């Protein structure tokens, strides 16, 4: 009943504008900087959206120097009630085969050189110390509608799992690929941290569509992953996160979601020392 | 018999000037920037103590943000011999109770923003190449006077433990809490490291009551940490670190630390090439 | 028959220009900065060489500030095909004694401070987006020459094993090195990463002579790492990484490098989107 309004982050193959009816561009600024490219207005079927190229709509923007801070406050500063991204990622499992989506529910951060809250103490917008909680990184109920859509699609869907977001923009070693199994991380990327962890500071529902691409390095005697594999495997399989998408988000708007957005609004307001 | 002066650093919730006796204020700038606070000179008993707010008297510095070299370098420079802080954690192990201390004695770093040598190349104050060892962090002569007052006080303590320090300031992921216990890892900070490091450079007896205030979100049944659990526990036990410290540091004051602390300069003195 | 060129860069205690005849020093500027040291240009037999001092040659740079991007883009511009590196390392292994070298073949970054890519976005020399396969960190033919090499000289030499390097510069705690050994790691240091990945990037053969001179921390009840102990065991070990180095080079300089120089060229030009 009460309204959404859906930001679409769009990873690596995964970022496109057709995907929305309706398109208006419009570039924003933030105090955090500028995000990442244009915001692209528009809709699908009744639901407003904002899509947002996480690495520029030319793939300008590596993994560690992605504004995260611009891109999820430019994202708030519209009006978004939920943030529904795309990544790609290794698979470090063998049955999460490439092309399979993982709707995560984790993850382990291996990042390095990357801001993971609003409140640094330099921004008069985000004033106070503040310490988000992590032990439910994403959002159950909308993962959930993403799961059950998955399967009213017949695809490849895997309901859980656990990313470990690498700084990058080098791939794993193969020791670093065994050990990552070790720890149990499922799948690998360079993105979700601090997406993530920003959306949740910013309380906004947050969800991942993970698509695995590629299956890292750690069969020893196998084809390890390269950009062009993972460029091929999404040239392939682009159009399930799409679909999905498309599928899943009339639905999120058909329920109410107002007590699930107080029940975050809280959890971030009472992390923050003013 | 020779002379002793404690700095203590106080931590979340843990930072009262009242413990001190006569008083004083004193700013200071070091070649390293401003401590998070004014130094607060004082007596326990006989004893000369000096105590600094670690994340400033209101609370205003966030965990990656601490000026860790400047507080220990004001601490040095105002001729303290040992340095003995609180730390609030969360615990990784049953057996560690909300409201427990445990006397760390070792560490595992997760940080990645700090700085965590006086010797940058960057300071005409600390020439050369420092490498400092680490394979026995926190001072056991200091530690083993924490763990006998503590059994005195009748206080559930623990007599060793390993700190993960992670960078915040956001609470860890599930899967990264679980991951922690795997590594050994019996409680969880955002504060040890680099402190702990500085003060050996420093030649300083270093040692840490870290209190228990939480469960990280490891049991993912029951209740996860937030901002308000941490402050509630640490209002119900605060007293607990208060009574430590003021029945410890006499007992420091009346024994012999020249032949501690000459070995300490000589470790710190002999990781230098100038 | 195909022209080679061997930049070598020196280590701890292993950075001696008089492995080179013919010497002449060239101090060069780089898009990334200035490199550690003057380049020494000299010959092995018939091979042309260039030396770099990783840490200056008075040893004054720490390895948290090696400009590894101005090194590396320092060899290539001067013509180098392979870069041989020494360094010194902790063992975390028994069989691995101080003394012993060991021709490393993976490694685990547990680097947080630096710039792993020349594809920053920053320089017009190195533009796009670059995502660097690692599942094969060094050379595996030029490892081979040096492992054969080794055993013709009759020195304790490991034909592979996996490096952790570290931030620095303090050295580990024992809980991290006990960590460290559950993960797999073999030998322990602080610049492996990222030089293994900027020479990957830059299309070079690189390989590492990691040569042990102390058992880290892990013996709780042993003798622990410290900056006069590494220093004493390079002192009394050197000579075996000049000699292998001495013999090894010429070996290099009689085989065929063009189809595994393309295929290493290949590699790094298909991991940029530009
Ligand atoms: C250059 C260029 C265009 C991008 C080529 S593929 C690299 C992107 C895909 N993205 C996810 C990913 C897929 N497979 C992975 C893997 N095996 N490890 C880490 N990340 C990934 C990482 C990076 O942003
Ligand atoms: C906002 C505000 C005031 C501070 C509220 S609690 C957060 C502080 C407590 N401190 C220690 C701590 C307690 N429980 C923890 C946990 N579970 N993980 C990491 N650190 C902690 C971390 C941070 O400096
Ligand atoms: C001060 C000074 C001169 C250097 C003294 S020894 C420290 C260097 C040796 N290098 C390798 C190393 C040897 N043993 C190690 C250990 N146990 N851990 C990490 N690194 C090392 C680290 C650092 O660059
Ligand atoms: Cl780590």
């Given at each position: 009943?009460?309204?959404?309004?859906?930001?679409?982050?769009?990873?690596?193959?995964?970022?496109?504008?057709?995907?929305?009816?309706?398109?208006?561009?419009?570039?924003?600024?933030?105090?955090?900087?500028?995000?990442?490219?244009?915001?692209?207005?528009?809709?699908?079927?009744?639901?407003?959206?904002?899509?947002?190229?996480?690495?520029?709509?030319?793939?300008?923007?590596?993994?560690?120097?992605?504004?995260?801070?611009?891109?999820?406050?430019?994202?708030?500063?519209?009006?978004?009630?939920?943030?529904?991204?795309?990544?790609?990622?290794?698979?470090?499992?063998?049955?999460?085969?490439?092309?399979?989506?993982?709707?995560?529910?984790?993850?382990?951060?291996?990042?390095?050189?990357?801001?993971?809250?609003?409140?640094?103490?330099s921004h008069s917008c985000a004033r106070?110390?503040?310490?988000?909680?992590?032990?439910?990184?994403?959002?159950?109920?909308?993962?959930?509608?993403?799961i059950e859509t998955?399967?009213?699609?017949?695809?490849?869907?895997?309901?859980?799992?656990?990313?470990?977001?690498?700084?990058?923009?080098?791939?794993?070693?193969?020791?670093?690929?065994?050990?990552?199994?070790?720890?149990?991380?499922?799948?690998?990327?360079?993105?979700?941290?601090?997406?993530?962890?920003?959306?949740?500071?910013?309380?906004?529902?947050?969800?991942?569509?993970?698509?695995?691409?590629?299956?890292?390095?750690?069969?020893?005697?196998?084809?390890?992953?390269?950009?062009?594999?993972?460029?091929?495997?999404?040239?392939?399989?682009?159009?399930?996160?799409?679909?999905?998408?498309?599928?899943?988000?009339?639905?999120?708007?058909?329920?109410?979601?107002?007590?699930?957005?107080?029940?975050?609004?809280?959890?971030?307001?009472?992390?923050?020392?003013?």
């Amino acid at each position: 009943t009460t309204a959404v309004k859906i930001g679409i982050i769009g990873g690596t193959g995964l970022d496109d504008p057709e995907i929305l009816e309706g398109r208006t561009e419009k570039y924003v600024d933030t105090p955090f900087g500028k995000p990442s490219d244009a915001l692209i207005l528009g809709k699908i079927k009744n639901v407003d959206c904002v899509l947002l190229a996480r690495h520029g709509r030319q793939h300008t923007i590596m993994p560690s120097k992605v504004n995260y801070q611009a891109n999820i406050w430019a994202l708030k500063e519209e009006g978004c009630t939920h943030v529904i991204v795309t990544t790609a990622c290794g698979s470090l499992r063998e049955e999460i085969q490439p092309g399979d989506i993982v709707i995560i529910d984790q993850f382990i951060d291996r990042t390095t050189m990357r801001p993971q809250s609003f409140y640094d103490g330099s921004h008069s917008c985000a004033r106070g110390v503040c310490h988000i909680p992590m032990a439910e990184p994403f959002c159950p109920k909308t993962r959930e509608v993403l799961i059950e859509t998955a399967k009213k699609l017949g695809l490849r869907c895997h309901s859980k799992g656990t990313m470990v977001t690498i700084e990058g923009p080098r791939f794993s070693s193969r020791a670093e690929s065994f050990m990552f199994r070790t720890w149990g991380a499922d799948v690998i990327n360079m993105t979700t941290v601090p997406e993530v962890v920003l959306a949740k500071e910013a309380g906004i529902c947050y969800a991942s569509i993970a698509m695995a691409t590629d299956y890292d390095c750690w069969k020893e005697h196998e084809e390890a992953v390269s950009v062009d594999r993972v460029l091929k495997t999404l040239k392939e399989n682009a159009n399930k996160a799409k679909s999905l998408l498309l599928t899943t988000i009339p639905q999120i708007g058909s329920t109410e979601w107002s007590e699930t957005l107080h029940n975050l609004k809280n959890m971030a307001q009472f992390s923050v020392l003013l």
